[PDB]
Write an enzyme that holds these catalytic residues in place. Sequence first.
Site, short mmCIF file in Angstrom:
data_model
loop_
_atom_site.label_atom_id
_atom_site.label_comp_id
_atom_site.label_asym_id
_atom_site.label_seq_id
_atom_site.Cartn_x
_atom_site.Cartn_y
_atom_site.Cartn_z
CG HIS B 386 -1.94 -1.02 1.44
ND1 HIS B 386 -3.23 -1.10 1.13
CD2 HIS B 386 -1.64 -2.15 2.04
CE1 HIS B 386 -3.70 -2.22 1.52
NE2 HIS B 386 -2.74 -2.84 2.06
CE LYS B 588 -10.09 12.00 2.26
NZ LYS B 588 -9.96 11.28 1.01
CE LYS B 594 -4.48 11.08 3.85
NZ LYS B 594 -4.65 9.96 2.97
CB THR B 705 -11.56 2.51 0.12
OG1 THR B 705 -10.81 2.64 1.31
CG2 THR B 705 -11.04 1.38 -0.71
CE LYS B 709 -15.34 3.42 2.66
NZ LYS B 709 -14.90 3.80 3.98
C1 LIG Z 1 -13.75 4.65 4.20
C2 LIG Z 1 -13.21 4.82 5.46
C3 LIG Z 1 -11.84 5.05 5.58
C4 LIG Z 1 -10.90 4.88 4.36
O1 LIG Z 1 -10.84 6.08 3.68
P1 LIG Z 1 -9.50 6.72 3.17
O2 LIG Z 1 -9.96 7.22 1.76
O3 LIG Z 1 -8.56 5.64 2.91
O4 LIG Z 1 -9.20 7.89 4.01
C5 LIG Z 1 -11.32 5.52 6.75
N1 LIG Z 1 -12.13 5.78 7.81
C6 LIG Z 1 -13.47 5.55 7.72
C7 LIG Z 1 -14.33 5.82 8.93
C8 LIG Z 1 -14.02 5.07 6.55
O5 LIG Z 1 -15.36 4.77 6.48
#
Ligand SMILES: *Cc1c(COP(=O)(O)O)cnc(C)c1O
Lengths: 858, 858
Positions: B386, B588, B594, B705, B709
């Site tokens: 990763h 995030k 970031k 990810t 979402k």
């Molecule tokens: C989706 C999710 C993450 C992962 O998101 P990143 O894009 O990798 O920051 C982190 N924390 C929560 C609570 C999530 O639902």
Amino acid sequence: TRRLTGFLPQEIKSIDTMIPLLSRALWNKHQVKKFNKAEDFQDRFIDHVETTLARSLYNCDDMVAYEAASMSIRDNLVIDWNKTQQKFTTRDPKRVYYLSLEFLMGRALDNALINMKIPREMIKGALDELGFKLEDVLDQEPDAGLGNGGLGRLAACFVDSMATEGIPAWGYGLRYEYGIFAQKIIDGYQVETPDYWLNSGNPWEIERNEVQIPVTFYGYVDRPTTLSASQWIGGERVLAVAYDFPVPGFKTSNVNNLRLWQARPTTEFDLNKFNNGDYKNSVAQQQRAESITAVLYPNDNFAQGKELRLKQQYFWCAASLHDILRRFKKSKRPWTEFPDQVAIQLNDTHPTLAIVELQRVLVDLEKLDWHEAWDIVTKTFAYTNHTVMQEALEKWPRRLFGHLLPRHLEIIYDINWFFLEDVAKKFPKDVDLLSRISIIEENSPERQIRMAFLAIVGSHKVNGVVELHSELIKTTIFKDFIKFYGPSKFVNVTNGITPRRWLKQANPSLAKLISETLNDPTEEYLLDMAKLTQLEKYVEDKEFLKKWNQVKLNNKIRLVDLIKKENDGVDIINREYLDDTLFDMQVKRIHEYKRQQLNVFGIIYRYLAMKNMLKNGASIEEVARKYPRKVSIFGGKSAPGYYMAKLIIKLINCVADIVNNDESIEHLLKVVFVADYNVSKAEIIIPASDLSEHISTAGTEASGTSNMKFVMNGGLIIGTVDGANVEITREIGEDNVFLFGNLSENVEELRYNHQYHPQDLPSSLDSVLSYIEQFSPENPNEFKPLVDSIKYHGDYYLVSDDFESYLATHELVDQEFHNQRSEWLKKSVLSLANVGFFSSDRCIEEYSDTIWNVEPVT
Amino acid sequence: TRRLTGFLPQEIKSIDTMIPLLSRALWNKHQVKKFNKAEDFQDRFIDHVETTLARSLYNCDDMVAYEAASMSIRDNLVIDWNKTQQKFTTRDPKRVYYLSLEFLMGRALDNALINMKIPREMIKGALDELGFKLEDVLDQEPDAGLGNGGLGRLAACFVDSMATEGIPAWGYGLRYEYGIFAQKIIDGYQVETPDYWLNSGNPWEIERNEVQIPVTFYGYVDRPTTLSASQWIGGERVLAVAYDFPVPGFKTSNVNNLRLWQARPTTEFDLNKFNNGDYKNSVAQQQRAESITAVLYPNDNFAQGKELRLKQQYFWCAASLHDILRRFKKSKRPWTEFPDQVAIQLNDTHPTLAIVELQRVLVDLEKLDWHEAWDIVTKTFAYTNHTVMQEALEKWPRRLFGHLLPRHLEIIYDINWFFLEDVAKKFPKDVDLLSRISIIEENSPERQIRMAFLAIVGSHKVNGVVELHSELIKTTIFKDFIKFYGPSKFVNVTNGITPRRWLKQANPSLAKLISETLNDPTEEYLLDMAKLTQLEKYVEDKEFLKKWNQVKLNNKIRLVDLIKKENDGVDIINREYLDDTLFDMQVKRIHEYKRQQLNVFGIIYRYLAMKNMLKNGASIEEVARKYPRKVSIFGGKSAPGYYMAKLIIKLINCVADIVNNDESIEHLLKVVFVADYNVSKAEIIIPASDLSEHISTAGTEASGTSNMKFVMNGGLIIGTVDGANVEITREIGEDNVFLFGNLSENVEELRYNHQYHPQDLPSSLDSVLSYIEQFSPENPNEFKPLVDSIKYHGDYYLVSDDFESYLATHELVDQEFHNQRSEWLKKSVLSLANVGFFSSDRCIEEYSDTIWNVEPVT
Ligand SMILES: *Cc1c(COP(=O)(O)O)cnc(C)c1O
Ligand SMILES: *Cc1c(COP(=O)(O)O)cnc(C)c1O
């Protein structure tokens, strides 16, 4: 929303109308009902395996089965715990709050099966059909690590009897995470271990995360005269979260409650600290908080422990009183009616701070007059006293107490002031009385606060635990308080034990025999122990006695099975010849005054006599004829730092290693020690007893409940004329107990002659003290401090004095039991027949009627 | 007895015959069945209230109801958890073990209601009839403090998909007591707090007190050449106790498992110590042990933490491998078939010690040839990588590693040796290659063990998380490894997210819409995300788009409700006008790369621009027309010592205090920071998103990810052409994402020019940097380090470079959304329509087919 134990009737009549009829109908057509049949239990059991425990038929083992069965029984209990709590809210009767520092609860499941109105046989049935042996699932339960000795067991039996009697009582205590400790005998020595009883949660509690009381320590009082409403600006605050334990009664559907407190930090985690890498401190608050409910009786032999013991006793008194006044204010009744509605019993001195705290909240928060508040306190409390010797009475030093509890010191000085005025007005010019009767002991250099005297001054009744003890507290340690208050305030209620755990749970085979002979299929004799005197008729006739003996033989087999299990499958006791093997036990706290060493010196003596006889050419038929087949069973725990008590445990283990493995005496004698004797072990050990030792130096025991547990099961007592032995003798008859040794009058003189006019040790005793100065080859002078306490430090517990008498009574016991068992069996049946006064139901009747003035609300 | 997850078929065919037909019949006539109807759930629920929780209709509040309902659902789950585990045992398919240091599980109840084969509506029904609002009871659940960022959430989604697909997979991890920490924003600052998620237990686990693995630290290897079976005589041992979390799959009745470990001391309480008054030390061991699972990512910025992190990673690798080989040996299959039966995925480098450990156990305990073992290791592992920047690759120093793990150092030296020989034979005389590709980094003065290189050398497949990342690891950090191994070994499987939590749970109202429109009452589209492309047909027609928007509006209301609740009933977001309020979130991890500061600088910029505009006499209708109603939603946590990240949180809070309370801009802009953003918050926050920020410096993100979402819920992305943004773009079309900023090629040069040839800051940016050098009156130079990093330390994250582009794209967004919502809505519907490749079900298909070579066993 908001109230968990009862809606005031009015609230319900208002709310009910705003709920739509369809919601009320649905709720009503799906409200849970209690098991009425085995199928009902099976359905709850299987749903918990599959859903809660996410398990199946193929992997539901005995721990799973117990977890599931416990969850099902608690479900049933909760339905009646809710009804009962609502009945008392709706009916507002006077309530009893029983404060105890320890509740020796034991194991909850089987007790719930017996105190279950619609049965152990239905559940038994149901479980067997699903694949389970009840007895195998019963063993999965850890004994609740919530108490330790008889003090806690007395609170436990009481809680049961109050629930059976529909008396509105609640017990308040602490939820110890780790027990007092747990005992392993490693290499003949006791090693202390954490008593991990919550390792797989606890299926019997209700965690009430909703009830969180704040409790405060340290700080300062700012007024900007003590008598006035003052402000305690404290320095630390912890949280008390309640856990509810439901308590069933026999044949009632009245389920009463035990509320235990766990201490929690006001701040669980500190992220600032953690993020700066100060990990240890980010969780520090949590650590301090949890000390308060981590361990029972924390080692107070140094300042930090003195502090933590006081800290713990305040936390429980504080939170419990808070919960007791909160419930009172839902009544919306005037403070002047508090004594008519609340009765709080101080089981020993440990909750005396509750007195000072009720005075503190009524004056500082509730703003009553100091004198009006104090009248309420006085009429609300009563104190049971369990102490003989004055030295064991609890005192706290002013510096420590003051620092930890600044306002409560102020009120103790005030309380004492007016009391000493009242004394001066009743006995003008009696100078020394004022010094003696005072709550603050003016000592070098630290002044003490005498807690037992604060408890007499704050209570409306004090009571001893056995008539002779009671006479003695009026005659000795509290004499001045009797002069000032009058004999009336000092009462007696002899202790007792519950029939359902100690006879029906512990000895079913006898409980069936009695229900058979007396023709009482409903076990009504457990509610009315008085009916057991009918057994006396059947004393004279043979088949009954055969029956009575058989019960006791099967009970002996259970104990033998336990000792084998505990010995990794190896048997210690020789199973053939068991009906002629006298089981002689002394299971209790290892302490020099309990004289386990007198009992061991007696064992070694007999062994030395046997061996010597063999070597002088007697056949074992001749030796055995004189010293017949016996098994001495010892059990109990020593305090962590009591060197001499820990020596006595090693010594018993050493005797057992030589005697048990000595071929020459061909199993005529065995010594066994049971580790980590808790209640469950006592439920196997007591019904197996042929004889039980109750041999403390005369004048040292106040009451003594295991004695009563042995009597209720047909065991005979060899004991000193002290403690509960005296009342056992009254009730069942002198001709049925084996008493010996010196009486209390002779104790102070025999003690004096030991030092300032010594006679010499009896040859018998001198043979055993030289023989251990048994063998111990690795360290041939390990047992010396014991021998030299008797032989060179005045033998303060009178071992020398009683040795010959003890041995003479044992010669009697031996002949009685082995050679004329029909006479032995008559003593046992008559014991049973007359044990009934010691039922804790009768103790609770007496307390309810003389002290609490409480009626059942059922 | 003994095996909790499956009896080998044979065992059952044998056992079955010994069970009496009546037991088997009873057990069979009372075996729990799964709910088939609401009444069934009602009955379980009421029974848990009354019995488990010992409560009644009159005091069963919502916490009670949740506890009860959770308990009922887990019950159902357990029934199928057991069946599934047994099927796999019976069918012995190749299994997948997914090792991850964090599993961001979120809240389990509703997920269970949805992945429930016979429904949220039935349960919903049932609860309501009993007096409960599902949603009120859903809120009682703490989010499992078992993960933190995306790494863990990837593991979480995967776990779900594997379960739906009937892939035989288990996840192994740690049961953190306190989470990573929990965030309170106190006075605009993040204050770290303990994440107390287990405060009222946890109704979803199965505590398997039965599974206790020992794990060892320190010590020495004694042989009396490393290659040989050696003995590690370690110096500390802790215990790993498993906790099973059942994992449902959608429409399957296949329930897979997550097994988490808790560290326990080998010795809980030390009575010796306690009794001597050394209270502190008596509980010391407990304390050390519990450090290992106390907190996630322990502060390693000092030796003690370096150590604890290694310590923790070893503990979990160790215990999990152990459990993985244990299960293997029930197969009784030859070690040479291990690769044919076990597939272990290293989710990142944290479990690389599992390689060294499988080699260690196969060579030291199992006694295979070093070379035969190594062949198995090699064929068993696969590594998902990763990491982009080489600096983030985990290395451990030899001294520390060696000290804590002596044998595993030896094997690492060996592993490295042969690898380096192989390299020498493949590239004769290449001197420097050998230095570079080596697992041991010869550095000043502490040599490091490069974990990621060890992971390449030990795996048969390495994969990146997104195609570009993958190419990059072959091209950069692992180039030499590609030379030596060949490209084949380096694969790509782009990450993804589960449809059931992220679409059906988080956004039901949309899930209904799709099931309505696509006429798929069975929600089959969640299994076949490919069918969502049919939504593209309905892109063109109005009622549908109305419908689509309504969903999103109601979703926004929910978020608003949340922020109000979180603000003590006070609303922050102005509810009227909500359909025209663009919700723009960047939730995030707070980290300079970031670029939350870029986003804040953008907010302040807009605010400064708005304010300035107002003061320059524009009517809010004019200001609003240029800068329309927006709510910037920030959420995320900073690492405890990242000063700059913590500054950024204060700064966001400061901005929010000035902007939110500034009457002048009349609610055209609100900044809201959601504290302690966890998954549940993300399930409320993501379906409410109108736009989500994905703005890291280019070249810094491997996949990402939450991006996906947001896409699955019709949210649009403003992002850098980096990370998952690139693949989002491929799938849904470039025309549907708002990309900006520099590309990676340009990053190194732009960075160079910053220092050794500086240009100057854009005025826009200079305005905001001076404006904060927002206001902060109490300490008017608090935000200086931030400003000086950009302004004086080469602005390494290219804020300056992207500022203008960012603002430009925002202008686009604003117009798109407010003014041409049908175009916006088409982007959203098409997003949805083409998000399907990012279904973690497809990730799992790929993994299963290229790497694991695993088939479903359902
Ligand atoms: C989706 C999710 C993450 C992962 O998101 P990143 O894009 O990798 O920051 C982190 N924390 C929560 C609570 C999530 O639902
Ligand atoms: C009965 C009981 C006690 C009380 O007995 P004492 O005679 O007061 O020693 C203590 N411990 C256990 C386990 C008991 O059952």
